[PDB]
Design a protein around this nucleic acid. Structure first.
Ligand SMILES: [Mg+2]
Ligand SMILES: [Mg+2]
Ligand SMILES: [Mg+2]
Ligand SMILES: [Mg+2]
Ligand SMILES: [Mg+2]
Ligand SMILES: [Mg+2]
Ligand SMILES: [Mg+2]
Ligand SMILES: [Mg+2]
Ligand SMILES: [Mg+2]
Ligand SMILES: [Mg+2]
Ligand SMILES: [Zn+2]
Lengths: 287, 148, 108, 166, 132, 275, 152
RNA sequence: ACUGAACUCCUCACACCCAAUUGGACCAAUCUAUCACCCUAUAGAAGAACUAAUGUUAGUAUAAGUAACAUGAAAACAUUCU
């Protein structure tokens, strides 16, 4: 059953979490220096593989926690809740930076993952849903897209306006729940063990393990929902303020199975858009 | 006054009279002074009446402590855990006897306003009144002005 | 007219704890991107403005030293140059104010 | 005079058992004899009651009242001592559990009136107290909804008894 | 137990503030377990004050809590091996031998890591100042 | 300063009283407070209950195993009440079953078992022991005595009474001190049940009676927020029991409960227990 | 009732208001940047713009010279007004002054404003900059713009 | 017909509802004699008892955070201007 699959996937997730935590026992102090433009020269002695950039923001002030979406640990984007590994240089990226492109990409991926969760838990029990991938599209595209294969029983069914609004209501319920984006660097073996059932996710995991030097893969969980991440994600879902599953377009070249691309659009609390601008964005997010 | 004082409902400790009567008083403690006009009455009570009361109330453990004391006292502890302390300072032998007898016959419940002089666990035998008692029923249970 | 009765503490609390009297929470406070200190949305950052005022005061002290006396306002433009800077082609024909410190990053 | 607020930081609790929730830290700080009316200080205290340390500091930094600067200094001192001495891990993980203004020791002066009469000015001084509790600020008491409020009404209806009878 | 009355006679006045200052308002559960090698004197030197250096390689336990009884240093159960160079001093009429100072060599291993993360603020620059 | 001593003494007494009320000391077993003699207390316990307990048996009943373990641990630096408690619990269960079966022959074995469990449960037995002073005379390693230990001690006392005076006297004791605890208690207040309508259907099937027909007997304020529904269960067009409720479902459930009470003979107006 | 009244009531009267604005404007011409109560700066901004216009009118214009003579108490600034400020803004048609709000005066918590003449040599003020075009919302709006352009 | 008191009856208990005035029984606290010795007893005394005198002294409220008060402008805080 899908509930059993989710339960066992979460069990494996927790097993991997505990395994890594035990592999990193005790407390090793790692020096992380704030290289950001503001509050320069500060140094945090942090618990190795336990503390997070969110903990660094907690030390700094509440404004850093509320405004920082990503961390450039040694020039690489790190999720605000990803444990730090070694002494490094850290700079917090917000939505209003001069070049917030990385933050925008992380937000786009997080919204796509939320859409995937909504899609997987939306349909009725009889129909089977397979989340194939979250294509990485530019923000200029006007909509974050998530690719899903629906059942042959529904290959002739197109979501109605009410169905789309129900999807949005589920996404908003998730946002209200405000679940943190848990992250894990998990070896391809354990990733395949978790996602053995989903062939699409199996092959995506294999592709990622081939791309990276080792077989390390990025697993992400909002709640009870685990997915392979193309990159760093948002800390929490409550960052999202406006969210709208806009359309579902059936990809034209679908001989073997009918792939449907769920297109949606969102805006964080920091970047709220007026009602009319939001409506125009929604209109343009249906292509 | 009642509004400026706690109140309770008439009750027993453990349904003290249903099966058998159990004397609620369980402990008496008389702090008395060998010397002192205050405890002359207490000394006379201990000499003459305490033994008779003790044998009359075998269920009450009575302690007598002769201690330097300017105000002799009797502390009564009941089965329900209540503790009542009464000063016998300058009380005659008869006054002490009456006070001790009242303590023996009394229960551990607080001496506060009692809301009702009665307490029934089964107030109704024929069925507590409700608006539909004494109201006749109608054919097919049709409410007034019902078409069908 | 004099009060006819002492006003009770209950009435006084009702009056002086009213929301109309309570201090309102400000929601236009933000963090300045440049320095990270707190500012209001419509108001200039206090820290950055203090920087600018201090640098302006130094430049104005230099200007006063150059002018040397009241009523000596130049009839030509002014250019501020810091250590390691040389007048440019457009800086020609403009009075030069020399500063002993290096060029501030925010100054341009 | 009383100085119990200062002593309140010297209470040492016994070590907690491993299977016990982590006791949140608590820091009592105060400033005595502030040249400011306690009535005026109370407004700022009430303003910052229940808020996080950072939010309270932000609110006070942009307040025109004189007491705002004093309260900000007191809060900064409380944060510093909480981190240094009370083993508070994060500066920002503090919220104002209690903030009140107390009357200080005042001085009496004479105000000269028009016809050889006078009044007694009081050079008012006030104390200021804060308790900083570690952890995120408690959520604001949500307004009671119609569902719960009608639930209360129905409970009151059910609680009715036949009064003054058997 | 914070028995400062006995600590005064057990340690020198130069050592007492080190013994007791930083530990105020926090419970310590220091305990001793069997030593590893027998304690032996190292050297002695000398209005007149005695001085004896004793090297100890013992095994001990720590559990330092907060005002609120929450652990902040060391496991209470797991013991650690401690190498110390303890220097006693004596008054020379009624004085006795009391701990005077612990010599920590530069090559000593780093002590147990702290439990809580810490921050070390950088220069709090004034407006005119610029970070370097 | 005012010369005098009596006002100062009175004020000190008032300050002490207020301090005690604000910060009452931790509870202490009565054994450790002044004016305590264990032998006199146990004799008075027996005489209060009007029963000729054997003193050694009563002492052995009041002593618990945990107390023995704690005492031995302290001595490092006695017969427990296990068997007496077992005997008392067994006899109490059997005798309560006899009482309840005699009083309510129509009560099913399940109902009788549940009533006995309620009467011998931790809450009721603990209340009875607390108000009978068993807790004061209980020897335990911790205070306040936990409800399990208090119940064990109370049943040990019952077993001691059995071994001293006999089954008849012990049955009288049980009737007096546990059967009285169900006075004023409602059948399903003592025996928690689920799906009373289903249970009633089962009972009628056992009695070879068709399933009852739930029918709306009376109604008020149907469309309001405070409705009253009187629902009656009819057997072959004969009313067996009717019950009120706020919703029709609740009224039907309560009517099923009333029908169960009538069938089992545990109605509110049933014959009171005989003492 | 003050419907349509556009001039604040400042100082001790009309003449005192004019003199206060005159002093503020003289300081503005001398220093190219002035801090003053927000209302006074707002009142004096129009007069600053009008002086720039009069300077544009030319040195040889008698009316402009008289206006400058009145409005600049320190007469050494009149050559400055006619030979630095006006040539500086000869290209512009307006908006010669930049006015911004400043944190309230510590003394009396007055609403403070900084007013400067654009293009001065002094260090630039921390001007409020709009959000970067690379933000999420701005990129989405860029997508809107591109789609609309292509479609129509 | 019923309702209807502090009238009357009923169970129990009884000195326990008049201004000025008058008779009487007790008594808080203090000191002294002698007791007592976690607050007292029998007596002898007396600056021996305060919801009230626009009472006296001290404290703090209310009116009230009100009436009322104050610093000409810019600035390099040199200086200049009104
Ligand atoms: Mg005069
Ligand atoms: Mg004016
Ligand atoms: Mg009548
Ligand atoms: Mg009468
Ligand atoms: Mg007098
Ligand atoms: Mg008085
Ligand atoms: Mg008076
Ligand atoms: Mg006031
Ligand atoms: Mg008024
Ligand atoms: Mg006024
Ligand atoms: Zn800034």
């Amino acid at each position: 059953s899908p509930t059993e699959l989710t339960e066992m996937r979460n069990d494996l997730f927790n097993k991997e979490k505990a395994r890594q935590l035990s592999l990193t026992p005790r407390t090793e102090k790692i020096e992380v220096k704030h290289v950001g433009k503001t509050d320069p020269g500060t140094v945090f002695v942090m618990n190795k593989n336990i503390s997070t950039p969110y903990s660094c923001a907690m030390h700094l002030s509440e404004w850093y926690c509320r405004k920082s979406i990503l961390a450039l640990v040694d020039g690489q984007p790190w999720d605000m809740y990803k444990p730090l590994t070694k002494s490094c240089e850290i700079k917090f990226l917000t939505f209003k930076d001069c070049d917030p492109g990385e933050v925008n990409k992380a937000y786009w991926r997080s919204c796509a993952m939320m859409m995937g969760c909504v899609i997987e838990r939306a349909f009725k029990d009889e129909y089977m849903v397979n989340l194939v991938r979250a294509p990485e599209v530019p923000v200029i595209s006007g909509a974050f897209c998530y690719d899903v294969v629906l059942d042959s029983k529904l290959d002739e069914w197109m979501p109605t306006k009410e169905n789309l609004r129900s999807f949005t209501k589920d996404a908003h319920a998730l946002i209200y729940k405000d679940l943190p984006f848990e992250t894990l660097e998990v070896e391809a073996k354990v990733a395949l063990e978790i996602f053995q059932h989903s062939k699409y996710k199996v092959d995506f995991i294999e592709e990622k393990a081939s791309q990276n030097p080792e077989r390390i893969v990025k697993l992400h969980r909002i709640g009870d929902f685990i997915d392979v991440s193309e990159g760093p994600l948002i800390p929490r879902t409550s960052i999202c303020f406006q969210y709208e599953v806009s359309a579902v377009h059936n990809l034209q070249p679908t001989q073997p199975s009918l792939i449907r691309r769920f297109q949606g659009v969102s805006l964080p609390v920091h970047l709220r858009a007026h009602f009319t601008i939001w409506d125009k964005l929604l209109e343009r997010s249906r292509k | 006054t009642a509004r400026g004082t706690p109140s309770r409902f008439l009750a027993s400790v453990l349904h003290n009279g249903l099966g058998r009567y159990v004397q609620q008083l369980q402990r008496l403690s008389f702090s008395v002074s060998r010397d002192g006009a205050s405890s002359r009455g207490a000394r006379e009570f201990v000499e003459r009446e305490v033994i008779d009361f003790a044998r009359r109330n075998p269920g009450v453990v009575i302690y007598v402590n002769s201690r330097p004391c300017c105000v002799p006292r009797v502390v009564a502890e009941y089965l329900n855990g209540a503790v009542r302390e009464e000063s016998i300072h300058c009380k005659s032998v008869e006054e002490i006897s009456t006070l001790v007898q009242k303590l023996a016959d009394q229960s551990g419940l607080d001496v506060i306003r009692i809301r009702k002089p009665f307490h029934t666990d089964n107030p109704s035998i024929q069925g507590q009144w409700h608006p539909f008692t004494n109201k006749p029923t109608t054919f097919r249970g049709l409410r007034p002005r019902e078409v069908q | 007219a004099a009060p006819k009765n002492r006003r009770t503490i209950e009435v006084n609390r009702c009056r002086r704890r009213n929301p109309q009297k309570l201090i309102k929470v400000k929601n236009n406070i933000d963090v300045c991107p440049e320095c990270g200190h707190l500012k209001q949305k419509h108001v200039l950052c206090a820290y950055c403005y203090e920087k600018v005022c201090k640098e302006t005061a130094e430049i104005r002290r230099q200007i006063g030293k150059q002018e040397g006396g009241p009523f000596k306002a130049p009839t030509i433009e002014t250019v501020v140059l810091y250590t390691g800077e040389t007048p440019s082609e457009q800086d020609q024909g403009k009075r030069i104010i020399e500063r002993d410190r290096k060029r501030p990053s925010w100054f341009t | 005079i009383s100085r119990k607020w200062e002593k309140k930081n010297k209470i040492v609790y016994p070590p907690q058992l491993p299977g016990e929730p982590r006791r949140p830290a608590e820091i009592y700080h105060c400033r005595r004899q502030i040249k400011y009316s306690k009535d005026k200080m109370w407004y700022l205290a009430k303003l910052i009651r229940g808020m996080s340390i950072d939010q309270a500091l932000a609110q006070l930094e942009f307040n025109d009242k004189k007491g705002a600067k004093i309260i900000k200094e007191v809060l900064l001192e409380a944060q510093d001592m909480a981190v240094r001495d009370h083993n508070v891990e994060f500066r920002s993980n503090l919220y104002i559990a209690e903030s009140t203004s107390g009357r200080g020791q005042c001085l009496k002066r004479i105000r000269y009136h028009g016809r050889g009469r006078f009044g007694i000015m009081e050079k008012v001084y006030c104390h200021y107290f804060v308790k900083l509790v570690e952890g995120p600020p408690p959520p604001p008491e949500p307004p009671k909804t119609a569902v719960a409020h009608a639930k209360e009404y129905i409970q009151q209806l059910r609680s009715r008894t036949i009064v003054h009878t058997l | 137990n914070s028995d400062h009355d006995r600590l005064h006679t057990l340690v020198t006045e130069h050592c007492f503030p080190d013994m007791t200052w930083d530990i105020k308002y926090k419970t310590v559960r220091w305990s001793f377990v069997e030593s590893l090698e027998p304690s032996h004197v190292v050297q002695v030197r000398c209005n007149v004050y005695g001085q004896i250096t004793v090297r100890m390689h013992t095994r001990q336990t720590l559990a330092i809590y907060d005002r609120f009884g929450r652990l902040m240093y060391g496991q209470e159960d797991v013991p650690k091996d401690v190498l110390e160079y303890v220097v006693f001093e004596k008054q020379l009429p009624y004085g006795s031998w009391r701990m005077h100072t612990k010599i920590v060599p530069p090559w000593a291993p780093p002590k147990q890591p702290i439990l809580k993360t810490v921050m070390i603020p950088g220069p709090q620059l004034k407006p005119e100042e610029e970070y370097e | 300063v005012k010369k005098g001593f009596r006002a100062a003494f009175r004020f000190q007494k008032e300050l002490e009283r207020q301090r005690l009320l604000r910060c009452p000391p931790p509870p202490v077993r009565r054994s450790e407070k002044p004016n305590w003699d264990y032998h006199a207390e146990i004799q008075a316990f027996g005489h209060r209950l009007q029963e000729n307990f054997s003193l050694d048996l009563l002492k052995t009943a009041f002593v618990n195993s945990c107390y023995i373990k704690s005492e031995e641990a302290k001595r490092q630096q006695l017969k427990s009440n296990q068997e007496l408690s077992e005997q008392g619990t067994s006899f109490s269960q059997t005798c309560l079953t006899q009482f309840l079966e005699d009083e309510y022959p129509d009560m099913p074995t399940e109902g009788i078992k549940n009533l006995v469990d309620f009467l011998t449960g931790e809450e009721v037995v603990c209340h009875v022991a607390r108000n009978l002073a068993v807790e004061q005379l209980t020897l335990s390693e911790e205070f306040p005595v936990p409800p399990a230990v208090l119940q064990q001690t109370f049943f040990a006392v019952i077993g001691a009474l059995l071994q001293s005076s006999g089954p008849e006297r012990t049955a009288l004791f049980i009737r007096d001190f546990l059967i009285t605890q169900m006075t004023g208690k409602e059948l399903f207040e003592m025996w928690k049940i689920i799906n009373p309508m289903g249970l009633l259907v089962e009972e009628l099937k056992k009695r070879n009676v068709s399933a009852p027909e739930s029918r709306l007997t009376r109604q008020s304020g149907g469309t309001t927020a405070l409705p009253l529904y009187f629902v009656g269960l009819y057997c072959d067009k004969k009313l067996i029991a009717e019950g009120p409720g706020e919703t029709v479902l609740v009224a039907e459930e309560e009517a099923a409960r009333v029908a169960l009470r009538k069938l089992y003979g545990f109605t509110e107006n049933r014959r009171p227990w005989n003492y | 009732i003050s419907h349509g009244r556009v001039f604040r009531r400042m100082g001790l009267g009309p003449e005192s208001r004019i003199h206060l604005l005159r002093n503020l404007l003289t300081g503005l011409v001398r220093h190219e940047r002035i801090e003053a109560p927000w209302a006074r700066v707002d009142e004096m901004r129009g007069y600053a713009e009008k002086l720039i216009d009069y300077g544009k009118l030319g040195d040889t214009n008698e009316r402009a010279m008289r206006m400058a003579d009145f409005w600049l108490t320190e007469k050494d600034l009149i050559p400055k007004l006619f030979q630095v400020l006006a040539p500086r803004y000869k290209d512009q048609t307006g908006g010669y002054t930049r006015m911004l709000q400043i944190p309230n005066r510590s003394l009396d918590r007055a609403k403070m404003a900084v007013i400067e003449y654009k293009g001065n040599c002094l260090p630039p003020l921390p001007l409020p900059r709009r959000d970067s075009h690379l933000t999420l919302l701005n990129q989405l709006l860029q997508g809107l713009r591109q789609d609309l352009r292509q479609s129509q």
